[model samples]
Target: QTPLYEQHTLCGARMVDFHGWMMPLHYGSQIDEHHAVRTDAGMFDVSHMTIVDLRGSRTREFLRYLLANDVAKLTKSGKALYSGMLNASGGVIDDLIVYYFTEDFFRLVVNSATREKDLSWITQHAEPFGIEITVRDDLSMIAVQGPNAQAKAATLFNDAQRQAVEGMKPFFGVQAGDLFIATTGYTGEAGYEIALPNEKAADFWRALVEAGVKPCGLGARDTLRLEAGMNLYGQEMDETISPLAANMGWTIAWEPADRDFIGREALEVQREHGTEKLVGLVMTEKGVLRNELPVRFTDAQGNQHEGIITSGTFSPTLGYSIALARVPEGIGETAIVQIRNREMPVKVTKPVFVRNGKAVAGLC
Candidate 1:
């Protein structure tokens, strides 16, 4: 269980089993919590995410070989890079954030459900390099997100801590006393993800709540990330799924041709053959798009094509249903989604529906 589980129950959170720990699904209204984050400051108990610190001489070299993206580009301290760890077949093992601190240290935050596998994979590779891996179970994390997230969350910090976070760059992190504050978040809003000692979590929770930061739960978190077009691990891609097909080809850094990462060879082959691409869908008719729902299209000659929704949800911010589907590469401006027994027409566009509290093009 996370450090915030008891505090969640105090707020009448509806607890459900997530991965193995009991977690809050919602306080009462998931839609209200969703809007709260989109419009104002809201906090989430993200202590379930696994935080691992890497130390030793070969940390950067190890990461360059392990991740599909190049870590050598992290020239500034506290800079963050997002990358996919792939198997030899170019399938996604997991997506993670790597924060550079120094030559000897780097931090990784990985998904909760895949923590064990991620740790094992990293350790297996690091054995040869003798990198020291420290799993930070002593820390707890809270994500405060939305338009007012940074200012409201900063109020809980000390003056020095506030100074360190003031004017913080996006995707950067700084350690201020007991708190490690990162100008990073998953909800596509301006925010900070704070990691502090486990013992300090409850008090900070009270302080944020007293300062008017609404406590959000997992249900709202899902809707928020989906509307932002962020990929959820199990829903969008997994160990069996190719990162190229999941709209993640941009994350690959192919320059410096000598850097042969684990899956480079397979990715090259897949690139040559071309693959189905992930795209966004907005239903024009009244229907909620959902995972595994069939998406159909027609070529110029009227030949039918098929695809499937990877993730879908009702966008509270847009008041409509949106989805991310893996569809044929040549699909046109419009496609039809199979909702229930009826075929509903949908507009196709880029995956991102909202960013920084505003709707992106082709979403609404």
Candidate 2:
């Protein structure tokens, strides 16, 4: 359980089992929490995420070989890189964020569900370099997000911490005493993901509530991330899936020919030969698009291809059904979705549905 679990109960949250941890699914109304993040500021108790710290002389060199993206690009302190840890077959094991602190020190935040597999995979690779890995179980994380998030959250920080936040750029973090504050969030909005000692989590959560940051739950987090076109670990990609087909192609770094990261060869082959593509589907009809629903589309040559909806939801911000689907690479601007045995047409757009409280330019 998260350190904030008690706080969530006090706020009248409905709890559910999430990957063996009890987490809030909603506080009365999931839609209300979703809107709160889009219009104002909301906070999520994300302490379930695993934080790992790596240190050693060969740390950077080890990461360059372990992850799909190159850590050498993170030249500045607190700079963050999003990457996928892939197996030899180029299948995604997990997607994570790594923060560069110094030449031999760095921090990584990985998904909770894949914790065991990720640790074992990372440990196996780090052994050769004699790297030291420490999982920070004493830390808890809170994500305060939305348009007014930064200003509202900054009120809880001390002068030194606030100064660090003010000077921080997007995708950058600062270690202020015992707290690590980063301008990163799952929602497509401006905000911070603050990691602090577990003992301080409850008090900090209460203070944020007093400051008017609504407490959000996993349900809201799911819809918000899906609307933002962010990938959910199990739904978007997994051990059997390739990042190239998961709308995560942008996260791969292919430069510096000498830096041979894991899965580079398989990815290179896929890049040249191409793979099924992930795209956005907007349905304005009477039904909602759902996960695993079969999708059928025709190519330019009039050949029919089959696909499946990976993540689908009724977007609170857009008031329409939106989805991320894995479809044939040759899919056109339109496709037919199988909803309750009825064929419904949906418009295919870029994977992103909304950002910064508004629909993507052409989406609305």
Candidate 3:
């Protein structure tokens, strides 16, 4: 359970079991919570995410060898990089964010469900380099997101903390006393993900609620991230899925031919010949698209291919259903989806459906 679990119950939240942790599914209304984040401000208790810190003289070298994205690109302190930790077969082990603080110190935030496997994999690789890995169980995380998220959340901070985060750039973090605040979020909105001591979480949550930042839950988080086209672990990709086919190719850095990161060889081979790709689907009929539904499309060469939806949801922001699917390459502008025994036509589009509280142009 997170430090804010009791606070969530006090606010009339519906609790559910999420990956062995009890978490809020919604606070009364999921739709209301969703709108709060998109239009105004909303906060989520994300302390379930695992935070790990690394300290060693060879930290940078170890990360460059372990992750798909290049850590060498992080030239400044507090800059964050999104990367995929892959297996030797080029399959995604997990997707995480790494924050650079110095050559010897870096921080990683990974998914909670994959915590045990991720730590084992990381530790196995760190053995040779003798990196000091410490899991930060004493901290709690809160993500306050939306158009007015930063302004409202900053009100809770002390004067010095406020001044430190003023004018902070996106994807950057800063240490303000015991709180580690970063201008990073998953909902594709302007916000800060603040990590503070576990003891401070409940008070901060209550203060944010008093300040009118609605408390959101995992349900609203799912819809928001889906609309933003962000991939969810165990949905869009897993240990058996390749990053190349999971709409995560952009997270991989392929330059500097000599830097042979794990899975580089397999990814190189897949890059030259992989025929599967992840794409977005928008339902045109009245029914909703669902996970594992068959997506059938015809290629320009008149060949037919069938794919499966990896993630699907009713996008509250768009008032329609959208999905991400792994389909064969060369599909055209349209496809047929099997929904409730009916073959419905769908428009193929870029995975992203919304940004900054508005639908992407041409998608609506």
Candidate 4:
């Protein structure tokens, strides 16, 4: 299945083991790949991500009840919605994005690691609603991102291809003849990820590279998404955490009183109870790095509390190590993060401070 393996190899990508698959960790330098997306355009062979097409008359109703986020907000055709699939207890099963088409058919993009879980979960719930889930294995996924990504994608297509994507806006999608191209991607850059026939992948890859979109790898994908304030399915979230506790509470809409979805009761219970807090941290000192580190805290009277770090990395934009932590209730505004035996004062901010190759602080 490494048909494009030679393509990455030809580009001098340093291929290695990722999860269970032999994938490229970086082409030369991970930071370089990271910087490319900030300044210019970069590409990733995201074939590992699975594409599932949901087609049925009741597809809209089925989705509204299946996810934590209200799919009803997607009133416009091609509107994309991001949400989490949760267990009855409000724990995240998997976080995925659903692209709305017409009332009868829509597309869903899910993680490669949880492809089986996503399918089983969706199918089990979808059965009663009379909607059938069809996994699209005939296509490969490619993410072309950055400041120049739009122009690059626009350049690769012929007049017909241009016409197919011209009508689609960001967070929207359009279907061409056998091509499902969307102006949406995870990197927070202006780009389009196309899901086309497996055979077309090679030719498109050649054409894209010929048009000068840098071929990026998974390593870059992680760093870019993190800097963009996006969360990974298994890293920043998992089955033990709910959207409320995972910095994804904004995805839930409590507007329509009549709309009931899975995990609503659990969400309400958690909201009332108000569990631990999820917030971002920026390191104050530079002596020690924060990955694989523990966060310890002490109250005013010397009482102690502890929290674990979920995702931490040296943000290319911020020029320091930043992380998203699930902290015990009480710590707010300014707190301390523990690394090894030392505690460093960290300024607590919102989950994402950077997106779209620019700074988006409170001022933004």
lDDT of 4 by residue, 1-364 (tens): 4446778888888987765667788888888888888888888888888889998999989988888888888888878988888888888998888988889998889877899988998999999889978898888878888889878877877777788777666887777775677888878788888778888888888888888888888887877887677887776778888788888888887677677888889988999999776777777468434554666676666767776667787877668777777777766566776655666877767777577788666513
Q: What's the best-to-worst order under lDDT?
A: 2, 3, 1, 4
Ranking by TM-score: 2, 3, 1, 4
**How badly does each model clash, as a count of residue pairs?**
0, 0, 0, 0
Q: Residues 1-364, candidate 3, lDDT per residue (tens digit)?
A: 7888889989998999989999999999999999999999998989999999999999999999999999999998899999999999999999999999999999999878999999999999999988999999999999999999999999898999999998899989999997899999989799999999999889988999998899999999999999898998888898788899998899989999899799999999999988488899998567788898889988989998999999998888888899999899998899998777777889999988889999999675
TM-score of model 4 (CA atoms): 0.93
Error of model 4, residue 185, in angstroms: 1.7
TM-score of 1: 0.98
Determine the backbone clash count of candidate 2: 0
**Which is superior by lDDT, 1 or 4?**
1
Give the TM-score of each candidate: 0.98, 0.99, 0.98, 0.93
lDDT value, residue 282 of candidate 1: 87
Give the least accurate 10-residue stretch of model 1, judged by summed lDDT. Answer: 355-364
Instruction: For candidate 1, write residues 41-123 as lDDT tens digits.
Output: 88899999999999998999999999999999898999998899999999999999999999899999997899999999999
Instruction: Give the CA lDDT, 0 to 100, for residue 79 in model 3.
Output: 94
Q: Which pairs clash inside model 3? A: none
Q: Candidate 3 at residue 101, lDDT? A: 96
Q: Native-vs-model 4 lDDT?
A: 0.79
